[PDB]
Paper text:
Niemann–Pick C1 protein ([name]) is a membrane protein that primarily resides in late endosomes and lysosomes, and plays an important role in cholesterol homeostasis in the cell. [name] is a 13-pass transmembrane glycoprotein that resides primarily in late endosomes and lysosomes. The second luminal domain of [name] ([name]-C) serves as the intracellular receptor for Ebola and Marburg viruses. The viral glycoprotein (GP) interacts with domain C of [name] (termed [name]-C here), which is one of three large luminal loops of the protein.
The goal was to co-crystallize [name]-C in complex with primed A82V Ebola virus glycoprotein (GP) as part of an effort to explore the basis of the enhanced infectivity of the A82V variant in the 2013–2016 Ebola outbreak in West Africa. Human [name]-C (residues 371–621) was expressed as a C-terminally polyhistidine-tagged fusion protein in E. coli as insoluble inclusion bodies. After denaturation with urea and a nickel-affinity chromatography step, the protein was refolded at pH 8 using the glutathione redox system to facilitate correct disulfide-bond formation. Although the objective was to obtain a crystal of a protein complex of [name]-C with the primed and glycosylated form of A82V EBOV GP, the proteins did not co-crystallize regardless of the glycosylation state of [name]-C, with nonglycosylated [name]-C crystallizing alone. The two disulfide bonds that were expected in the structure, i.e. Cys468–Cys479 and Cys516–Cys533, are clearly resolved in the electron density, indicating that the refolding protocol was effective. In full-length [name], domains C and I fold into similar structures, intertwine with each other through an extensive interface and form a tunnel that may function as a path for cholesterol transfer. It is likely that the absence of domain I allowed [name]-C to crystallize as dimers using the same domain I packing interface. The overall structure of [name]-C is similar to other published structures of [name], as expected, with root-mean-square deviations on all common Cα atoms for each aligned pair ranging from 0.36 to 0.78 Å. [name]-C uses these loops to engage with its binding partners, explaining the different configurations.
Residue numbers in the entry: 401 to 607
The structure:
């Protein structure tokens, strides 16, 4: 009777903490293993791969786009994806945005992250990048829904990422429910056969 939850919890066991040192000054900001830039690129590609899973249901193909919660559709049909990567609009190149010299970096994904976790609905991070914080589904991503293992409200210290793909409930529509469940089986098969030594992944699909 409520939305269906497909979910991943991702950790980076072989990755160390690192230190963001802001420019021109500012105090050091620690960043947990899974907010390493290379880990975030890997996770974005896993997320996109999930977005492009297709299941076979009799003579139809079922995509996530067919079954996902797209509350702003038909005008914005982007699937709702609650993920830290949506602060970068699920874009490798936004994630790599940086303002810097040959010696110094004035703004980068650290800056954007630190701003967005406090202003998730903002269209402009007020920094030299001027990047939006809104996810590509047109809505905000609250930091406590997509990060775990941090202390207080220091989301930069997160030790796990939470990625959620809401799917329609299809209450009183068993036919479409069949397609959603076929896609969920394919989701499970994919993730259970995805082994990346730099990542641990807990994964669940709706019962």
């Amino acid at each position: 009777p409520f939305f269906r939850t497909e979910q991943l919890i991702i950790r980076a066991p072989l990755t160390d903490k690192h230190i963001y040192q802001p420019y021109p000054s500012g105090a050091d900001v620690p960043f947990g293993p899974p907010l390493d830039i290379q880990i975030l690129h890997q996770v974005l590609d896993l997320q996109i791969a999930i977005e492009n899973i297709t299941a076979s249901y009799d003579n139809e193909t079922v995509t996530l786009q067919d079954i996902c919660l797209a509350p702003l559709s038909p005008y914005n049909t982007n699937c709702t994806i609650l993920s830290v990567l949506n602060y970068f609009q699920n874009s490798h190149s936004v994630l790599d945005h940086k303002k810097g010299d040959d010696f110094f970096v004035y703004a980068d994904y650290h800056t954007h992250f630190l701003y967005c976790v406090r202003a998730p609905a903002s269209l402009n991070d007020t920094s030299l990048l001027h990047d939006p914080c809104l996810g590509t589904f047109g809505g905000p991503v609250f930091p406590w829904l997509v990060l775990g293992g941090y202390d207080d409200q220091n989301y930069n210290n997160a030790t796990a990422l939470v990625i959620t793909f809401p799917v329609n409930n299809y209450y009183n529509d068993t036919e479409k429910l069949q397609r959603a469940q076929a896609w969920e089986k394919e989701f499970i098969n994919f993730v259970k056969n995805y082994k990346n030594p730099n990542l641990t992944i807990s994964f669940t699909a709706e019962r």
